[PDB]
């Protein structure tokens, strides 16, 4: 089987004061809270076993919205992310939840048009490793950047000052269970310094990373400008009576 | 002196599921929570004694944002609005807070460009009564509508099926303390059926209602479409380090 993981932690400071009290991932994006989008993408892949990671202070509001998943035809489990570490350390918390299965990890503020199903199906037919999804963007300096040559990723660089390409590595990662070994057997405070790019480069060096360029639009929702854009793009998105309630 | 009142109650159902957990007035409108806007308009009028009315379930989140007002150079008092009654019954809760002073009542989801100061100054020079602010709109059927003839309001009608005019009566009302007598000495369940328009028509019949047409833009933020519009219009609004924190 295939497990789903949504990373909804973070300070959301980029968005203060709107996120003074509210968690970024509960802010509107179209007619739905940001996080709904991630839940919908996974549901459309028949990935119903989902783990939600978020901060201690915001778990109440997240759970109030998501509940057990009954109302969305899915099933949620929650873990708390602590003050220290970021996106990479948060993934470690899912080791037991995943077990020997495979993963689709979606950073909560990554909103996009594409059904991820086709990429999940390819990954399912991939003997081992990982898969990243790329999106060509205007300001690659803000993201992880894929350096592609002759249809192969030679290197990934986090926030490069002078980008080698414009292919941003989106926050949708497909991983096998070996990712936990890398993190798990790091270590120790080196795991606090770890970034998702390092994990991706680890698969790359081992020669088991694959990639696909996404078709539709994509955007993060972590700044006022990008949050607004996400709302413009999401205006007409409709998830059906199951997500419209109630 | 002049008191400020912000009515931030309501079910927010028009906006479900975004308002499943979050109160409508804490949703983003530009780089700030909706309610901040109302607080800023009053502050710019040197109206620092403000009462916030909201539902029982959402008071925690509202207070978490607004606090005592110290951080905004204002001063808040809060009262809870019950299940029954609406916008008119909520105003009754402010009788003691206001006392013998005058009021500026702002419905929390009414976002607009104009400084209300000029209208507050005119009202201050008005011997008694009330003052409404009008805005010419595209779909008057959704609002209270002012029927103007020879520069005088002949009548106000709530949600008219066949509007006599396109001047919508915006949710910014200036009242003297006599408004509480009308409500107070209604009554009884007739007060549950009461609408703000009735109050306005009461002043009108007594021949003490005045009006002004607003200059800039205005919009409610009570539907997905109008909430989005409000966000577009509010993109560049900046309230300063006092409201940007922290
Ligand atoms: O996803 C939001 C948040 O994640 C950060 C973490 O530093 O960047 C990660 O996600 C990006 C896509 O959102 C990737 O391009 C990047 O490689 C990854 O580190 C923040 O920059 C961003 O605000
Ligand atoms: O203000 C939001 C909310 O108020 C209602 C209450 O029925 O209408 C009131 O406010 C309007 C402006 O927002 C006025 O035009 C109207 O006269 C007044 O009743 C709702 O219609 C609206 O969603």
| Chain A: closest CA distance from residue B81 (Å) | 22
Token couple for B149: 């003839």
Q: How far apart are CA B206 and CA A74, in angstroms?
A: 60
Q: Is A157 close to ligand 1, i.e. is its CB under 6 Å away?
A: no
Q: How far apart are CA B220 and CA B143, in angstroms?
A: 10
Q: Which residues, 6+ apart, have CB-to-CB distance to A114 below 8 Å?
A: A214, A215, A216, A218
Q: Which of B26, B227, B245 sits opposite A22 (nearest CB)?
A: B26
Which single residue is written with the structure tokens 């916008």? B87
Residue B143 C-alpha to ligand 2 middle, in angstroms? 6
Cα–Cα nearest to B24, from B39, B37, B36, B34? B34
SS3 B84: coil
Q: How far apart are CA B88 and CA B175, in angstroms?
A: 13
Residue pair A112/A172 in contact (Cβ under 8 Å)? The answer is: yes
Q: How far apart are CA A20 and CA B87, in angstroms?
A: 28
Rounded to 5 degrees, what angle do the CA atoms A157, A162, A165 make? Answer: 65
Residue pair B100/B179 in contact (Cβ under 8 Å)? The answer is: no
Asked if the Cβ–Cβ distance from A246 to B32 is below 8 Å, we say no
CATH superfamily of B1-246: Spore Coat Polysaccharide Biosynthesis Protein SpsA; Chain A (3.90.550.10)
If you count them, how many residues does chain B have? 246
- Give Dmax (Cα) for chain B: 51
Q: How far apart are CA B24 and CA B35, in angstroms?
A: 9
Looking at residue B186, the DSSP 8-state letter turns out to be: S
Q: What is the DSSP string of chain A?
A: -EEEEEE--S--GGGTTTTTTS-GGGSEETTEEHHHHHHHHHHTTT--EEEEEEETTTHHHHHHHHTTSGGGT-EEEEEEE-SS--HHHHHHTTHHHHTTSEEEEEETTEEESS-SHHHHHHHHTSSSSEEEEEEE-S-GGGSEEEEEETTEEEEEEES-SS-S-SEEEEEEEEE-THHHHHHHTS-STHHHH--HHHHHHHHHHTT-EEEEE-SS-EEE--SHHHHHHHHHHHTT----HHHH--
Token couple for A229: 């854009």
Residue pair A25/A90 in contact (Cβ under 8 Å)? The answer is: no
If you count them, how many residues does chain A have? 246
Cβ pairs bridging A and B (under 8 Å): 72
Torsions phi, psi for B172 (to 5 deg): -135, 105
The partner residues of B33 in beta bridges, in order of sequence, read B28
Indicate the domain borders of chain A: 1-246
Which of A14, A22, A242 is the best residue to mutate to test the B interface, defined by the most B CB atoms within 10 Å of its own CB? A22
Q: How far apart are CA A79 and CA B174, in angstroms?
A: 50
Cα–Cα nearest to B60, from B83, B34, B26? B26
Asked if the Cβ–Cβ distance from B16 to A245 is below 8 Å, we say yes
């Amino acid at each position: 089987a295939m497990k789903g993981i949504i990373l909804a932690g973070g300070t959301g400071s980029r968005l203060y004061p709107i996120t003074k009290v509210t968690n970024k991932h509960l802010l509107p994006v179209g007619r739905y809270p940001m996080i709904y989008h991630a839940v919908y993408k996974l549901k459309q892949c028949d990935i119903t076993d989902i783990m939600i990671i978020t901060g201690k202070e915001h778990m109440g509001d997240v759970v109030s919205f998501l509940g057990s998943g009954q109302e969305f035809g899915v099933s949620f489990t929650y873990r708390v992310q602590d003050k220290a570490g970021g996106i990479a350390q948060a993934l470690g918390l899912c080791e037991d939840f995943v077990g020997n299965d495979r993963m689709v990890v979606i950073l909560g503020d990554n909103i996009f048009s594409d059904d991820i199903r086709p990429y999940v199906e390819e990954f399912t037919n991939q003997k081992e490793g990982a898969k990243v999804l790329l999106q060509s963007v205007d300001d690659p300096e803000r993201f992880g950047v894929a350096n592609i040559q002759n249809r192969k990723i030679i290197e990934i660089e986090e926030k490069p000052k002078e980008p080698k390409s414009s292919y941003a590595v989106t926050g949708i990662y497909l991983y096998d269970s070996k990712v936990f070994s890398y993190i798990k057997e790091l270590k120790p405070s080196a795991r606090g310094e770890l970034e998702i790019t390092d994990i991706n480069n680890w698969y790359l060096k081992r020669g088991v990373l694959t990639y696909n360029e996404m078709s539709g639009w994509w955007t993060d929702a972590g700044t006022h400008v990008s949050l607004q854009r996400a709302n413009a793009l999401a205006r007409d998105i409709n998830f059906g009576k199951q997500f419209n309630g109630e």
